[PDB]
Every structure is written in structure tokens, then in C-alpha cells.
Amino acid sequence: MEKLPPGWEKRMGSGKIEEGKLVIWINGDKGYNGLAEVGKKFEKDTGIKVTVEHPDKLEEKFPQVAATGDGPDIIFWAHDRFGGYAQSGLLAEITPDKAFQDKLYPFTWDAVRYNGKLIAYPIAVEALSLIYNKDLLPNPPKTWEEIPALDKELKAKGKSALMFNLQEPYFTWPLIAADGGYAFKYENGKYDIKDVGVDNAGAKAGLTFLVDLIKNKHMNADTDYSIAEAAFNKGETAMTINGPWAWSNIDTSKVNYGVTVLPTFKGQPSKPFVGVLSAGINAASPNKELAKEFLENYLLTDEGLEAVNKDKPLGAVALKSYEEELAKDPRIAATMENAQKGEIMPNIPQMSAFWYAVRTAVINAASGRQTVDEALKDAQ
Ligand SMILES: OC[C@H]1O[C@H](O[C@H]2[C@H](O)[C@@H](O)[C@@H](O)O[C@@H]2CO)[C@H](O)[C@@H](O)[C@@H]1O
């Protein structure tokens, strides 16, 4: 027998993030190449190489991988996941000086506050819009209710009315919330985790309309991000539902498209969840100063955001100076019109489970594995 030797816990350990460089995680639907260009700028000014990666399921991996040799110095995701990360102590506190704070809309900072700390930098405000083919559909529908009839008409030309991703609850949430579905009730400065609205009559009606759309063969339960994107970008479906990031690929397809208000349901506006794309610094990073310099002086500038935006559009950006130029874009006006009708996502730790529950519920209802009532009861 011997005592455990020095550094044993490091031999049995998961490693350490490398000092002297920057590793960034951002989702694969975002402008990671443009972000790498920013990285390149940072490198030639500082010598510090910036590596940008878009792993799959990064928002799920981060809490297991954060404090390991594979953890990134900087993580990008919509602000909803960050409260969970903060509670898990995964996030370094963010300390921008006053002059820097003033450069971003104050309400974007609020989106990245958890328990009276700033736990990330806000980048851009995101929301879904109805994206339509102006040649197939010069006047897109104002109501969800008229979509089945519109589909039948388009099927006579070997076309369809609507395809969008049915594997992520994010995309059908605007329908679910329209007549009163909600995640967590907000009452007096606080989210009440005991008051969940995925099971009420608004949610049910919304999800039922989706299920009927599928049953009546206006939509297919198996449609995902890729299938719906190809279909719209090839001119096979008249409308899709997506965010600003999706606009680059449509530009390339030379489909003649518009971005407009989502259709109403039961006379009520569709209420898409609003996400603020945010950048957090890893608590286990030994490069926190570099990360701060990168985010504040390279990314969050007119030149930095543009580089990313040109790769894949960001939405309404948190940086005032550059947003004034993006605000003129009709697609951004539409984006903001849809966001305004919806609601910002909660950032509470319970979001992650909420999302998984709602994801499961939609997939099961659409597949017929469960009725709407059974699925949403399970979720609640
Ligand atoms: O579907 C659940 C999912 O919704 C949101 O994810 C969005 C994200 O906000 C967008 O930036 C874009 O990448 O599409 C995603 C949906 O596929 C939540 O932010 C995410 O936490 C949640 O799991």
C-alpha cells in the first residue's frame, strides 16, 4: 500500500483548457466562418490564434465538457440556457466598463443577467418570421386557418403551402403560445416554476392544429431543418418558418422571397419565443482576459458584427451603432414585429428540462405516438 501520489487527480482527470489561445463554440446554423474572420483579425493584432467550432448538441455537452480539456473559452447560444450554466458555476462573471455597457441596448444586458450578475455578452435579438415565396404566393395568408385550403390549391401544381422544422419545439412554439400556451408564468419580477402553461387550452388548440395539418397531409411529421430548408430554397413549398440566420442560403437559391408577420391563430398573433444570441466566458478558461478583449474590442464592433452578419444574418444586433444600419432592412423590421408579439425566453435553470419535455410532446403528437392531450399532460 502507498498514499495517493501528487497529481493523481489530474491523471484520472479530464484535462485543462489550453492557455494562450481561444476556443469558441457556436451553433452550426450561425455564421461561424464570419466569426473565424474576426478571429483572424484578432490573431494578426495579438498573435493569439482563435479556433471556432460548431459541435453538435453543444448546448447539451457544455455542462459536462466545460471544465475539461475540450471545453471552449467562449460559448455562444441563445440566452435561455445560460441561467442553468450560471447556477452550475460554469460561467465567469462579465465586467464591462460603463462606456462599453452604454454601447449595447440596456435591455439586451438584462437578458443575460442571472441572480444579479451579468453572465454573458448579448449579441443579437432573434425571432422567427413567416418566410414566403413571392412568385408562388404574392399575398401570404394572415391566418393559420386558411393554410389547409391554400395547400390543397398548391398541391394541384405539385407544390405545398408550408414546410418547417418539426423536430425542434422552437419552431412550433409560436402556434402553441398564440392562443395562450406559455412556458413559465412571469409574476412580479420572477418566474414561477410551479405555474406551467404547456397543458392549457391555448397550447392544446395550437398543437392540435399542427397535428391535423399533418393528418390531413399538409405537413409531414418527419420534416426537419434540412428538409424544410431544401424544399423552400428549391421552390417546392410556398412558405417556411425560420430565423434571420436562414436568409443567406435563400439569397443563394435565388428564390424570390419575403419575410413577414406570422399568421394569426384563433384571431391571436403567433407568439414566437425571443432569443438573444449570447457569448459566455467559461469559468474554467485560463484565457478570460483574451476572451474579454476578443468579445468587446473585436466582435462587438461595427466591423466585427458585419463580418458575422454577412456570413449569416444575426437579427437585431445588441450594438446600437450597427443596429441603426440593420434596422432599415425590411426583413429585420418583420423580425422585430414578430419578436414584439412574442416573448423573451426565460433563462431559469428549468428551461432545459422544459424544452426536452415540449420537444418530446410535439414529436409524439405529430407521429401519433400520443394524442395531443396525453403528450402535453406528460410535458406539464
Ligand atoms: O427547440 C428548443 C430550442 O429552442 C431554442 O433554440 C433555437 C435557438 O434559439 C436559435 O438561435 C436557433 O439556433 O434555433 C434553435 C432551435 O433549433 C433555444 O434557444 C434552445 O435552448 C432550445 O433547446
Author numbering: 1 to 380
Question: What do the authors say?
Answer:
In order to reveal the atomic-level details of co-translational folding, we determined the structures of a series of nascent model peptide with increasing amino acid length. For this study, we chose the human Pin1 Trp-Trp domain (WW domain), which consists of 35 residues, as our model peptide. The structures of the intermediate-length (WW11-MBP, WW17-MBP, WW19-MBP) and full-length (WW35-MBP) WW domains, which are fused with MBP at their C-termini, were determined with X-ray crystallography.
In this study, we prepared WWX, where the X-residue N-terminal WW domain fragments is denoted using the format WWX. WW11, WW17, and WW19 take an alpha-helical conformation. In order to assess the crystal packing effect, three independent structures of WW11 in two crystal forms were compared. Two chains of WW11 in Form I can be superimposed onto each other with an RMSD of 0.22 Å. In addition, the WW11 in Form II can be superimposed onto that in chain A of Form I with an RMSD of 1.65 Å.
